[PDB]
Amino acid sequence: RSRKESYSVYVYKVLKQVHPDTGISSKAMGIMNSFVNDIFERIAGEASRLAHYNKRSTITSREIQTAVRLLLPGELAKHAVSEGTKAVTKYTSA
Amino acid sequence: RSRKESYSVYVYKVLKQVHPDTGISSKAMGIMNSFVNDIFERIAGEASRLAHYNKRSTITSREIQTAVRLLLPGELAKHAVSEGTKAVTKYTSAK
Amino acid sequence: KRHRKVLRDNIQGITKPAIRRLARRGGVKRISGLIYEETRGVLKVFLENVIRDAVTYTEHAKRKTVTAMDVVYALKRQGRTLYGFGG
Amino acid sequence: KVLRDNIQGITKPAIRRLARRGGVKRISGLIYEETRGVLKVFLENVIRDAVTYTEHAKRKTVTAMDVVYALKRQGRTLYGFGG
Amino acid sequence: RYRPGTVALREIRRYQKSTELLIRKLPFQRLVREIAQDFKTDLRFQSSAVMALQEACEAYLVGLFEDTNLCAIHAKRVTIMPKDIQLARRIRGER
Amino acid sequence: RYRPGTVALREIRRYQKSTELLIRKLPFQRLVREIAQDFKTDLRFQSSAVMALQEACEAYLVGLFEDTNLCAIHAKRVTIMPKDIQLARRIRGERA
Amino acid sequence: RAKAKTRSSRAGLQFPVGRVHRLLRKGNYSERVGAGAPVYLAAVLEYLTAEILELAGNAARDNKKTRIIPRHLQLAIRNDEELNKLLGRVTIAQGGVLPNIQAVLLPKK
Amino acid sequence: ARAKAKTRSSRAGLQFPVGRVHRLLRKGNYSERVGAGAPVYLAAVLEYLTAEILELAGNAARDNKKTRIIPRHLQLAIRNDEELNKLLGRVTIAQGGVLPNIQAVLLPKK
Amino acid sequence: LAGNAARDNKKTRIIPRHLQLAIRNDEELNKLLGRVTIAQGGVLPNIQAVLLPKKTESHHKAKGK
DNA sequence: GGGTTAGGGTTAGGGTTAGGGTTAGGGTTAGGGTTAGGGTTAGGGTTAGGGTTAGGGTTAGGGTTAGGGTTAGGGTTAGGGTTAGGGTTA
DNA sequence: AACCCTAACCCTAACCCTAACCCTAACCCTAACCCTAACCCTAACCCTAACCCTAACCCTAACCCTAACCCTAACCCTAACCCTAACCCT
């Protein structure tokens, strides 16, 4: 195969981390799978246009950080930006 | 001085071919230039997704012909399809 | 031979126990005189300019069966994404 | 021009001829405030989008191209200015 | 007999607190098959496809009925009119 | 003075047969500058940018007024109400 | 490197088939594009370009302005049922739409 | 030759995958050059969004004495938050229904 | 204002409970009669939030015994 | 009429390794944004008119809320007599 | 897809209220005509502070790196919510 699957293990781990003794249902897994792939082509799709508008072709961390404030609203955008900055800091530290 | 791409000569030739003793204005040229670039990223953008949905990566004449019936309505879609078929036939007949 | 019912559902079935049941979910309380008739007509275009997209998609891949993977791409063009039955 | 001296930029007789272009004959009283509030909200949204765009480009000058791109992203492909 | 004004709200609450299908499956499948036959013959349908079609049609009908009721209740009228649907479609931009 | 029925239609036709700007430029520029200052200071504006902004605002206002008039004229009322604008915004999906 | 048979006119369209395809690759779409794709790109997209140009001058005849101006370009799209229903994400600057004061907007009728 | 080769939590501190995001973004014809520390941001954003959605779904499901997230609970939790309503406004979750909202004029008042 | 509240409980009589529920309902009527206490009236039926301290009810134990 | 004790029945929950794509740094080295002499574009003051915008008054001057024709849209009917669900294969 | 049963839920049809629609009565909300009196920018006239090119060198760009780990529904299975008897007020 060419690796075309589904987000199930990570979703279950996140659900168990945020809520113990919980789980996902039958159609809920497909709903979350279709929701992940929908925003995956929306955030990454705007970064390409934003890089092409400035005569560039490098989508780094700032290209994804700036795209958060465009798609996400207000408080969720700042929270996602803070989480991404903390993640990139923990990545660059070690 | 890096020049900017603009559709002016072809637009003027088309206007002179469909209407003699006519021309374009000042803002009309920029309006047509912004209109061409708008549909340029709409028709070509759908062909890439249509090719990716079928596990392919070849955008040929059929990928653009089928995208006409999706963006264009009814009579204009059939007219554009006929024009494209006649153009590709004249191209394949003589190079 | 063949059955004489070659009408293939002349846009019927969805009548009083269906239109009223669908309107009761939104918030409609009473129904006037007409109301219907055109209720079965406004749903005709919703299947005319959507199923044609699925047929045109299946015609590109040299197929003949409109699966669930092609019905979600047609609704995404109009602006009504559905999660669950598509995938 | 930084206090409430510019928010009340929409008058009352000037907005009468503005609505007459669409086909409005008679307006009301609270329209001068409701339309101003709606225009303020929409302008805040468009200005926020343009600021996010000019921050992506690391620029401090809101050009017409960024405004056109933001309007197209919102759902209004404006023609004329830009490209 | 029950005084008119309580059975309607009870039925509304009962149908809102439940997630059961209201339209049938075979008539809708025959309808979409007849519609598909108008464009190209020799066409089949699946189960998940017609299920998603029925779900989308139900959602669109619910939204249209809610918009019609919200437009009619603002004109001092508890009932809706056949012109209210066309009004809502013209405002939303459905044509 | 006297109430009419013909001067309104004449003004409507005159303003529809012309493509002249109705809102000023300097007040709109000061307004958008004050709005931009609320997010980040030290910001400038151009001419084509504020022109496109004024054109988009004029188109949006014309569309909103047309929708409000079409919603008000269908309820046996020649005038519009302040709630009709909120109704049109709720139907179009601008606020909720 | 022989004759001056440019790719811009190698097919048979007024739009440059050789240059409009130089921009076709400037969009990060799919890779291997067929020979008929640039021909189909400058034929069905130039149609919408040509249909709006020739109709704004016709709208200028009622305004006594002859030449296509930006104001007539928006009315050129709403001149037939094939061009108005065609474009959805198109809003020309000036315009001045047709005053649709029908018989209904007129006294009764 | 090498050493302990210790890691953080997984590879950056997130449970969401990182090797598939960079693969789907590079092979997705999005850009000819993809950054190294770029998919981590999108992975963290998606993880935070999924965690918030799952927490809202669990909070909505716990009210009905059911510790299992069903699509109805997801539809009730999505159509309740103000920040999540503006993002998924055009999303119609199948088998979710609507919200119990009845107009005050329809109720038998005075 | 009291008769409409009395008709809600299927009672065509004006009992002191109806008057107490009607006075404590309107804003102006409550602002005018804020210190007046009606005999045999009662408190308006209203609960209070922030009462459960476990809310989330997480799994402090384990799935495997 | 809906929550609940008994009871399975699909349907959730935890490794088990099986191992195979997938991301990661110095050996390079790179050409774009700064940082660099000319050349540009927005912002702060200056001046005088003339067309645009605040304000009463007025007009008896034109859209607009309580009674009361009907006709038109609900709840039961209660059988019953046509259709819609679910298990069979080939 | 079109191929005999199923067999009990599901879809027409009737009398009596609420509700939709028209006619007045009279207050009260709403457009311009020549008086109102300072008044109002935008059209002309300057005079301001680092942003655009500018690009020669400088210190990072993911590229193939090829050894770890993760890993996923089935595993043959078990973890929640079941569905008929039993059952809280209507």
From Swiss-Prot, chain D:
One of its GO terms (molecular function) is structural constituent of chromatin. The modification N6-methyllysine is found at residue 1. Changing residue 16 to W: In TEBIVANED3; results in early developmental defects when expressed in zebrafish embryos. GO terms for cellular component: CENP-A containing nucleosome; chromosome, telomeric region; extracellular exosome; extracellular region; membrane; nucleoplasm; nucleosome; nucleus. Changing residue 72 to R: In TEBIVANED1; results in severe early developmental defects when expressed in zebrafish embryos; results in defective cell cycle progression when expressed in zebrafish embryos. The modification Phosphotyrosine is found at residues 32, 69. The modification N6-butyryllysine is found at residues 12, 25, 58, 60, 72. Transmembrane segments: none annotated. The modification N6-(beta-hydroxybutyryl)lysine is found at residues 12, 58, 72. There is a cross-link at residue 12 (Glycyl lysine isopeptide (Lys-Gly) (interchain with G-Cter in UFM1)). The modification Phosphothreonine is found at residue 61. It is found in: Nucleus; Chromosome. Disulfide bonds: none annotated. The keyword Acetylation applies. The modification N6-acetyllysine is found at residues 12, 72. The modification N6-lactoyllysine is found at residues 12, 58, 72. Changing residue 21 to C: In TEBIVANED2 and TEBIVANED3; uncertain significance; does not affect early development when expressed in zebrafish embryos. Changing residue 72 to Q: In TEBIVANED1; results in severe early developmental defects when expressed in zebrafish embryos; results in defective cell cycle progression when expressed in zebrafish embryos. GO terms for biological process: chromatin organization; negative regulation of megakaryocyte differentiation; nucleosome assembly; protein localization to CENP-A containing chromatin; telomere organization. There is a cross-link at residue 72 (Glycyl lysine isopeptide (Lys-Gly) (interchain with G-Cter in ubiquitin)). This is Histone H4. It comes from Homo sapiens. The gene is H4C1. The chain holds residues 21 to 103 of 103 of the full protein.
Swiss-Prot record, chain E:
The modification N6-acetyllysine is found at residues 17, 40, 76, 83. The modification Phosphotyrosine is found at residue 2. The modification Phosphoserine is found at residues 18, 47. The modification N6-(2-hydroxyisobutyryl)lysine is found at residues 17, 25, 40, 83. The modification N6-methyllysine is found at residues 17, 25, 40, 83. It is found in: Nucleus; Chromosome. The modification N6-glutaryllysine is found at residues 17, 40, 76, 83. Keywords: Acetylation, ADP-ribosylation, Chromosome, Citrullination, Disease variant, DNA-binding, Hydroxylation, Lipoprotein, Methylation, Nucleosome core, Nucleus, Phosphoprotein, Ubl conjugation. The modification N6-lactoyllysine is found at residues 17, 40. One of its GO terms (cellular component) is nucleosome. The modification N6-crotonyllysine is found at residue 17. The modification N6,N6-dimethyllysine is found at residue 40. The modification Phosphothreonine is found at residues 41, 68. It is linked to Glioma: Gliomas are benign or malignant central nervous system neoplasms derived from glial cells. They comprise astrocytomas and glioblastoma multiforme that are derived from astrocytes, oligodendrogliomas derived from oligodendrocytes and ependymomas derived from ependymocytes. The mechanism through which mutations lead to tumorigenesis involves altered histones methylation with gain of global H3K27 methylation, altered Polycomb repressive complex 1 (PRC1) activity, aberrant epigenetic regulation of gene expression and impaired differentiation of mesenchimal progenitor cells. Belongs to the histone H3 family. This is Histone H3.1. The lineage of its organism: Eukaryota, Metazoa, Chordata, Craniata, Vertebrata.
From Swiss-Prot, chain F:
The modification Phosphotyrosine is found at residue 2. The modification N6-crotonyllysine is found at residue 17. The modification N6-methyllysine is found at residues 17, 25, 40, 83. GO terms for cellular component: extracellular exosome; extracellular region; membrane; nucleoplasm; nucleosome; nucleus; protein-containing complex. The modification N6-(2-hydroxyisobutyryl)lysine is found at residues 17, 25, 40, 83. The modification Phosphoserine is found at residues 18, 47. The modification N6,N6,N6-trimethyllysine is found at residues 17, 40. Its main location: nucleus. One of its GO terms (molecular function) is cadherin binding. The modification N6-glutaryllysine is found at residues 17, 40, 76, 83. One of its GO terms (biological process) is gene expression. The modification N6-lactoyllysine is found at residues 17, 40. Keywords: Acetylation, ADP-ribosylation, Chromosome, Citrullination, Disease variant, DNA-binding, Hydroxylation, Lipoprotein, Methylation, Nucleosome core, Nucleus, Phosphoprotein, Ubl conjugation. Transmembrane segments: none annotated. It is linked to Glioma: Gliomas are benign or malignant central nervous system neoplasms derived from glial cells. They comprise astrocytomas and glioblastoma multiforme that are derived from astrocytes, oligodendrogliomas derived from oligodendrocytes and ependymomas derived from ependymocytes. The mechanism through which mutations lead to tumorigenesis involves altered histones methylation with gain of global H3K27 methylation, altered Polycomb repressive complex 1 (PRC1) activity, aberrant epigenetic regulation of gene expression and impaired differentiation of mesenchimal progenitor cells. This is Histone H3.1. It comes from Homo sapiens (Human). The chain holds residues 41 to 136 of 136 of the full protein.
Swiss-Prot record, chain G:
The modification N6-(beta-hydroxybutyryl)lysine is found at residues 3, 26, 85, 108. Disulfide bonds: none annotated. GO terms for biological process: chromatin organization; heterochromatin formation; negative regulation of cell population proliferation; protein localization to CENP-A containing chromatin. Monoubiquitination of Lys-109 (H2AK119Ub) by RING1, TRIM37 and RNF2/RING2 complex gives a specific tag for epigenetic transcriptional repression and participates in X chromosome inactivation of female mammals. It is involved in the initiation of both imprinted and random X inactivation. Ubiquitinated H2A is enriched in inactive X chromosome chromatin. Ubiquitination of H2A functions downstream of methylation of 'Lys-27' of histone H3 (H3K27me). H2AK119Ub by RNF2/RING2 can also be induced by ultraviolet and may be involved in DNA repair. Residues 1-8 have a biased composition (Basic residues). Keywords: Acetylation, Chromosome, Citrullination, DNA-binding, Hydroxylation, Isopeptide bond, Methylation, Nucleosome core, Nucleus, Phosphoprotein, Ubl conjugation. It is found in: Nucleus; Chromosome. The modification N5-methylglutamine is found at residue 94. Its main location: nucleus. The modification N6-glutaryllysine is found at residues 85, 108-109. There is a cross-link at residues 3, 5, 109 (Glycyl lysine isopeptide (Lys-Gly) (interchain with G-Cter in ubiquitin)). The modification N6-(2-hydroxyisobutyryl)lysine is found at residues 26, 64-65, 85, 108. The modification N6-crotonyllysine is found at residues 26, 108-109. The modification N6-succinyllysine is found at residue 85. One of its GO terms (cellular component) is nucleus. One of its GO terms (molecular function) is structural constituent of chromatin. The nucleosome is a histone octamer containing two molecules each of H2A, H2B, H3 and H4 assembled in one H3-H4 heterotetramer and two H2A-H2B heterodimers. The octamer wraps approximately 147 bp of DNA. Belongs to the histone H2A family. The gene is H2AC4.
